[PDB]
């Protein structure tokens, strides 16, 4: 289901660029109309929610892994220290 959104990775770019080309021409109507632009908007616009969701998720997860890694980071150090006194 995550794929439902990562797929649109290109439509977004596409719609972006074309709309962008417009905002620097003031041809307004043309782009505003045109079924294709409508079409891409009609499929991108609705991803806001899903996309909003996924952001929080991976936002969290990334936060967690970093905290866990930090913990592991420390234990390792401790381990190694305790180990050093095992060398000699």
């Amino acid at each position: 289901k995550e794929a439902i959104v990562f797929s649109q990775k290109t439509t977004i770019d596409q719609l972006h660029n074309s709309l962008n080309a417009a905002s620097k021409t003031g041809n307004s109507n043309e782009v505003l109309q045109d079924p294709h632009i409508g079409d891409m908007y009609g499929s991108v616009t609705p991803l806001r929610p899903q996309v909003t969701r996924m952001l929080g998720k991976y936002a969290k997860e990334k936060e967690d892994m970093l905290s866990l890694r930090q913990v592991l980071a420390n234990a390792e150090r401790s381990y190694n220290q305790l180990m050093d006194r095992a060398a000699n």
Partner: protein, 91 residues
């Protein structure tokens, strides 16, 4: 691609346990097994954690990026429709 709770639980476990051992009357007194077999698992787990961590970050960015564009789209399209409707109004 995703760390399990079992793996995650072996970390605070190992970490904590390392302290119960921080100052004990020998090193071998710890290098008996439970510590060494635990360490082994935990250490191996570094690679998955990173692999898993990296994947989360990557995605997030791909998603930050996508979002950004989406905004800009739903930002231009308005600025354009706005003027367009104003023109009509100014008549």
């Amino acid at each position: 691609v995703d760390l399990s709770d079992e793996e995650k639980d072996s970390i605070y476990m190992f970490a904590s346990l390392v302290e119960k051992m921080k100052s004990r009357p020998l090193n071998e007194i710890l290098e008996d097994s439970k510590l060494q077999n635990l360490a082994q698992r935990v250490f191996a787990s570094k690679a998955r954690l990173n692999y898993a961590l990296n994947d989360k970050a990557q995605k997030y960015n791909t998603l930050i990026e996508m979002n950004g564009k989406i905004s800009e789209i739903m930002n231009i399209y308005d600025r354009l429709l706005e003027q367009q409707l104003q023109s009509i109004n100014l008549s």
